């Protein structure tokens, strides 16, 4: 059957350009059309034909395509060109067909120091005889982060759940970080703390069960 | 205003068919073919299928004729995608997506169905209010020990935007999903505006609002 071969991935600083390919046997001779898939959203159609735009798409997005490939230009890129980009044409005999797609990721952002909350356990939560800790870790850019929990400052090893930081409709990461307890070993510290990392800097957040 | 609304997500066994709806609304549903598109969890897109408005007529992906039924509802504007003898590699979000009329790209995209086939049972989530215990206050609700994703997160019915972060979901060992959603708010609201959080799991028909404060 047809195939359409993309890049992995590219990455591209703010402001700047790239070009994502998608190489196919005689591609030039089919007309080609592009998606951009944000992060937890539905593809959008950015290209179509090669080289049209449909509404809404700015001129510094541009498409080519010649021999055997085609190709995806992102110019000016802004932070919300991130995400996935897929290739398409319509062939007469294995009908619609797909790239494997790019990952794009825009970087040379500002730096964003991370916001943490620490949540102490629900008394609803107590009720039904378990402790957990919750850590939100939000509006960060870079993406690269060390949460550390400690129990009367002594590191834990046991019952941490920590999402890997994932972009948000904002651009900036956040990650969320959990800590389960028996209710005992909750109360059997003075403090609770959520330690994050990020480029350098280390916040703390403290929880203490004699303020609940 | 072209709109395509699907229906809800749905846990299914394997060996078994689900059939997901596409509502068309806002042009002529028969002036454009309707194609369905699936992604696999972190994969690319996978086209299923076309299907003539006017004709029922279909083009399949080869791969998927032999369990794949396409349909439409003339009467309703909705097209209808039935894939049966379901494996575990079916699970994936479907999408809808209308075709160019006389043409070949895929204009308008619906925003998907989380279709997950396992024999796993499903688990309606617990939710907690999250607070502190003693410039901005944080309030919250953790959405716990939920099967299979998706759930959504609305505070206030909807009303309550700003401030507002959903984060997404830890998978645990269990097989366990949990999610939290914070709202950021002046604390000089504390007391006046009440603080709910609505969460909806359309896998086990799971609907709870949780009164945080006030």
């Known amino acids: 059957s047809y195939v359409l071969t993309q890049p992995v991935s590219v990455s591209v600083a703010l402001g700047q350009t790239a070009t994502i390919t998608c190489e196919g046997e005689?591609?030039?001779?089919?007309?080609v059309h592009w998606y951009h898939q944000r992060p937890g959203q539905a593809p959008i159609l950015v290209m179509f034909?090669?080289?049209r735009r449909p509404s809404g798409i700015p001129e510094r997005l541009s498409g080519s395509n010649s021999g055997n490939t085609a190709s995806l230009t992102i110019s000016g890129a802004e932070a919300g060109d991130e995400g996935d980009y897929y290739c398409?044409?319509?062939?007469?005999?294995?009908?619609?067909?797909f790239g494997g797609g790019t990952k794009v990721t825009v970087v040379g952002q500002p730096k964003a120091a991370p916001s943490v909350t620490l949540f102490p356990p629900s008394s609803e939560e107590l009720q039904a005889n378990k402790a957990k800790l919750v850590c939100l870790i939000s509006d960060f850019y870079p993406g690269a982060v060390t949460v550390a929990w400690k129990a009367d400052s002594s590191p834990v090893k046991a019952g941490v759940e920590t999402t890997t930081p994932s972009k948000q409709s904002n651009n900036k990461y956040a990650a969320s970080s959990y800590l389960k307890l028996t209710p005992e070993q909750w109360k059997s510290h003075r403090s609770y703390s959520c330690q994050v990392t990020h480029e350098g800097s280390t916040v703390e957040k403290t929880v203490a069960p004699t303020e609940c | 205003q072209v709109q395509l609304v699907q229906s809800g997500s749905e846990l299914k066994k394997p060996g078994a068919s689900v059939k997901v709806s596409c509502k068309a609304s806002?042009?002529?549903?028969?002036?454009?073919?309707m194609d369905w598109v699936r992604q696999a969890p972190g994969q690319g897109l996978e086209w299923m299928g076309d299907?003539?408005?006017?004709?029922?007529?279909?083009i399949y992906n080869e791969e998927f004729q032999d369990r794949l039924i396409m349909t439409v509802d003339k009467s309703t504007d909705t097209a209808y995608m039935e894939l049966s003898s379901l494996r575990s590699e079916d699970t994936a979000t479907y999408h809808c997506?209308?075709?160019?009329?006389?043409?070949?790209?895929?204009?308008?995209w619906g925003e998907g169905t989380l279709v997950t086939v396992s024999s796993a049972s499903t688990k309606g989530p617990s939710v907690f209010p999250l607070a502190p215990c003693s410039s901005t206050a944080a309030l919250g609700c953790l959405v716990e020990d939920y099967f299979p994703e998706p759930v959504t997160v609305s505070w206030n019915s909807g009303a309550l935007t700003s401030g507002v972060h959903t984060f997404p979901a830890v998978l645990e060992s269990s097989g366990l999903y949990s999610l939290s959603s914070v709202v950021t708010v002046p604390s000089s609201s504390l007391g006046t505006q009440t603080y709910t959080c609505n969460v909806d799991h359309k896998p086990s028909n799971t609907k709870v609002d949780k009164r945080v404060e006030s």
């Open positions: 997506a209308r075709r160019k009329s006389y043409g070949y790209y895929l204009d308008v």
């Open positions: 806002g042009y002529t549903f028969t002036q454009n073919n």
């Open positions: 299907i003539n408005t006017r004709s029922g007529g279909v």
């Open positions: 005689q591609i030039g001779s089919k007309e």
């Open positions: 034909r090669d080289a």
């Open positions: 398409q044409v319509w062939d007469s005999s294995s009908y619609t067909v």
